[PDB]
Amino acid sequence: MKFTVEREHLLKPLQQVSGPPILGNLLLQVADGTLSLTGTDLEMEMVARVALVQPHEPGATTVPARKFFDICRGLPEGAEIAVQLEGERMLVRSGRSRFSLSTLPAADFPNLDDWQSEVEFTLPQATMKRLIEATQFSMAHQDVRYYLNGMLFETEGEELRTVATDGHRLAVCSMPIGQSLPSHSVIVPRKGVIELMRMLDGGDNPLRVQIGSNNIRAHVGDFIFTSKLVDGRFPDYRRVLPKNPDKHLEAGCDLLKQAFARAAILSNEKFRGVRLYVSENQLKITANNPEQEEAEEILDVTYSGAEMEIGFNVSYVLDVLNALKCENVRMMLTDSVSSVQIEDAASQSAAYVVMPMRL
Amino acid sequence: MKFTVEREHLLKPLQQVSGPLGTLPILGNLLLQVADGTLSLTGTDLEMEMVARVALVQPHEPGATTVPARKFFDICRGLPEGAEIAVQLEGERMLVRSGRSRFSLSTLPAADFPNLDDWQSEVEFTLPQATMKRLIEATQFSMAHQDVRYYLNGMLFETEGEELRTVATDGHRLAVCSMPIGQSLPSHSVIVPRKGVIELMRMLDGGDNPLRVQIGSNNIRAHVGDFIFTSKLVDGRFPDYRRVLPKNPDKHLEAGCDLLKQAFARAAILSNEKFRGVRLYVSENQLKITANNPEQEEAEEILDVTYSGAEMEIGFNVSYVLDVLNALKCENVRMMLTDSVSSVQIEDAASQSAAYVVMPM
Ligand SMILES: C[C@@H](C(=O)O)c1ccc(C2CCCCC2)c2ccccc12
Ligand SMILES: [Ca+2]
Ligand SMILES: [Cl-]
Ligand SMILES: [Cl-]
Ligand SMILES: [Cl-]
C-alpha cells in the first residue's frame, strides 16, 4: 500500500472519520484510484473517499486515528504526505519529517451488519441541517428511557420531519422535500445525529438518505455515514401539541430573550420557574427564588386576547429563543394549565412546546 | 444609599471587582459605598482585594451595603447598551431599576464585610501597563502548579537598579524577564501568589493609563485608572535565577522559532505520554529531533539551523520546550548549550530581555 496526497485533501476526510482497540484506528484502503478512510464505534461508521492523482499502490491497513490526524494537521499548509506500509508499521513522510506508526490488520477492522434499504430520498444538505439544528438541543442525553436519546425522523406525504424530546420539552421541524414518501418513522441515536449533522459541509452536494429496518445511511459528496437505529418506540408526541391555542402573542425575539435572560438570574436555580402575565399588547415577566430575590420585566408586544397568566421553565424557553434566532416570535397560549407552543412568527417549519408550571 | 449610573460606566468596574469571586457567603458579595460623590465597589477573598471608584455625576445619596457579586454583574451586563441603572437600598433589599426592568437583591450588612489589614508602603514606582503585561506573560507559564513548596506556585517580583524583574520556576524549568522602568529602585524581592498574578494581568485594559505599584513587607498594591488591587505576599526562599542560568553555554544554535516549534510539536505526538521525552542531535548547521514511545512508534525531524562547533546530543521534556517557544512570539530563537547533562538556556535571538532555562532528561 502506497499513496501520496496533499495535506488538506486528507484533513477534512480525517475529521469526518474520527467522529465515530482497533476502534481507535482508521481503516485505510487504496483501490482503483481511490483512498478510502473508515472510522467506526460498532454503532455507526463513516467512510471518506479521496481521489489519488499521484502514483499509488493498492493495499489496506489500519492506523491510530488521533496520532495520524495530529501528524497530518501538524505538517505545514499544503505539504505532500507520502504513506507506505512497511511490515507491521505505516511510514508517513513529508519533507524531512518522518513517522513510523503501529498498525493493526485491515482484516480485523469490524464491518457493520449488512442490510436492505427500504425507504430513500434525496434532499438539499441545507434542508437536513435545518431539520437537525432546529431540534437537536431537545434530545435526551443518557435517559434510561433509551428511545429518547436520539431524534425521530418521520416521513409523511412529501414532508420530512425531525422530532426531539427529553421527556419534558419538545422540538419539531418539518420541511417539504418534493417527493412522495411512505408514511414511516425511525429513531436515530443521538451520537449519529451529531455525526450526521457534522458531515454536512454547507455546500451544494445533495444528500441521499437510505433507511432500512434497523439502519440508516446518508451519502453526500465523498462521505458515507451509516448507523444503527434505536430499536424502540418514540413517544406519541402529538398528544402534547396544543389542539387549538386561542391566544397568540407576537414579540421581538431578542427583546423577549433578553428579558427572560435577566429575569432568569433571580429564578430558582433548580426548577427555573418564571411567570408571564399577558394583557393587551403587554407582557410582564416575573421571577423569584428561595432567598426572596425578585425580578420583573415589562415589554410591549402584539396581543389582543383575554388576560391570562402562565408559568414555565425559563431555561427551556431560553433554549427555544436561542434556537429560533429570528426577528419575531409567536407564542401560542391557551390557559395557565396548558402547554405553550413557540415559533418563528415568519415560519411554521419549527415548533417548540414547553409545559406549564404553577408558579 | 442611592445612585443612578450609566451601564457602560458600571460594567468595567463590576467586571474588575467581581471576576475572581465565587463557603463564607459575604465573600461572594461586593461592598458598595456611596460617599463624597463616588461609588466604591470592593471584592475580596481575604487574600486579595479589588476596589474600583466610580464618579457619580447624577444625584445620589450616601450609604453602604453588600450584594451578590455575580447576580449584580449579570443583571447589569444583561441590560441593553446605553441603559441608565438606578440603585437604591430599601430596607434589607437593594433595588435596581433600568427602563421597565426591576430587580430586588438580597444584602448582607456592610459592617460585616472584611478588611485587609492596614500596612505601610516601603517601595514605590510607576511603570507602563505594557511593561507589566510583558513581565507577566513572559514568565507566568513557568510557575509551579500546586507544588508543596507554596512559594513556587507564585511569581517573584524583583527590583534591582532601575529594572523590574519577574521570575517563575517549578523546579524543572525557569523563566526570567527584566524590564527598565527609569526610576532608581531599592534592591527588593517579593513573591506574589498565583491568584494575585492573574488579577495583576486582568487589570491591564491595554490603554495608556500607567500603573502605580506600592510594596510593603506583606502586601503589594497596583493602581491603574480608578481601580486598586491589593494582594498579600507569600513568604519563602525563592531560587536565585543568577545561579540557575548556565555559567557558560558557549554552544550557540539559532533557528526560526515557528519552524522549531512545529517540529517539536509533531515529534511530541510520538513521545511518551507521561514523560514526554525527545532527543536533540546538534551538528553543523543542523538539528535532528527524535521521539519514540513504549509501542516503538518513532518520529524524526531534521531542520536547517545556524550552528558551528561541537556535535552533541541532549534529551528534554518536549512540553517544556514547547512552552518556551510559544511564549517567545518572535522570529528567531537562540538555544545556548553546554553538554548532555546540563540545562539549556533559550532566548529570542533579537532580545536578551527574557531568558528560559530547562533541565535535561
Ligand atoms: C403518552 C406517552 C407515550 O407515547 O408513551 C408520552 C407522550 C409524550 C411524551 C413527551 C413529554 C413532554 C414533551 C414531549 C412529549 C412522553 C415522554 C416520556 C414518556 C412518555 C411520553
Ligand atoms: Ca534577564
Ligand atoms: Cl428586553
Ligand atoms: Cl420587583
Ligand atoms: Cl523514523
Curated annotation (Swiss-Prot), chain B:
Please give the residue ranges the record annotates as the region 2.
Answer: 126-240
- Where do the record's region annotations for 3 lie? 242-361
List its uses: Small molecules can bind to the hydrophobic cleft and inhibit binding of various protein factors, suggesting this may make and attractive antibiotic target.
Impact when changing A130T: Reduction of synthesis of beta*, probably due to mutation of its promoter
Record's subcellular location: Cytoplasm
Which InterPro entries does its entry note?
DNA_clamp_sf, DNA_polIII_beta, DNA_polIII_beta_C, DNA_polIII_beta_cen, DNA_polIII_beta_N
Disulfide linkage: none
The source's superkingdom equals Bacteria
Q: Where does DNA bind?
A: R70, Q146, Y150, Y151
Which molecular-function annotations from GO does this UniProt entry contain? 3'-5' exonuclease activity; DNA binding; DNA-directed DNA polymerase activity; identical protein binding; protein homodimerization activity
- Give UniProt keywords alphabetically: Cytoplasm, DNA replication, DNA-binding, DNA-directed DNA polymerase, Nucleotidyltransferase, Transferase
Q: Using the UniProt record, give the first listed, main subcellular location.
A: cytoplasm
Question: Annotated region 1: where?
Answer: 1-117
What more does the record tell us?
The temperature- and UV-sensitive allele dnaN159 does not grow at temperatures higher than 37 degrees Celsius. The global SOS response is chronically induced. The UV-sensitivity of dnaN159 is dependent upon Pol IV (dinB), it has an enhanced Pol V-dependent mutation rate (umuC, umuD), and is absolutely dependent on the polymerase activity of Pol I (polA) for viability.
**Similarity section:** Belongs to the beta sliding clamp family.
**Subunit info?**
Forms a ring-shaped head-to-tail homodimer around DNA, which can be opened by the delta subunit. Binds interacting factors in a hydrophobic surface cleft between domains 2 and 3, each monomer is able to bind different proteins simultaneously. The beta* isoform probably forms homotrimers which probably load onto DNA. The DNA polymerase III holoenzyme complex contains at least 10 different subunits organized into 3 functionally essential subassemblies: the Pol III core, the beta sliding clamp processivity factor and the clamp-loading complex.
Name the job this protein performs: Confers DNA tethering and processivity to DNA polymerases and other proteins. Acts as a clamp, forming a ring around DNA (a reaction catalyzed by the clamp-loading complex) which diffuses in an ATP-independent manner freely and bidirectionally along dsDNA. DNA bound in the ring is bent 22 degrees, in solution primed DNA is bound more tightly than dsDNA, suggesting the clamp binds both ss- and dsDNA. In a complex of DNA with this protein, alpha, epsilon and tau subunits however the DNA is only slightly bent. Required for DnaA inactivation. The RIDA complex (regulatory inactivation of DnaA), composed of ATP-DnaA, Hda and the DNA-loaded beta sliding clamp (this protein) rapidly hydrolyzes ATP-DnaA to ADP-DnaA in a DNA-dependent fashion, preventing reinitiation of DNA replication. DnaA inactivation is stimulated by DNA synthesis.
Q: What is this protein called?
A: Beta sliding clamp
Organism expressing this protein natively: Escherichia coli (strain K12)
The gene name reads dnaN
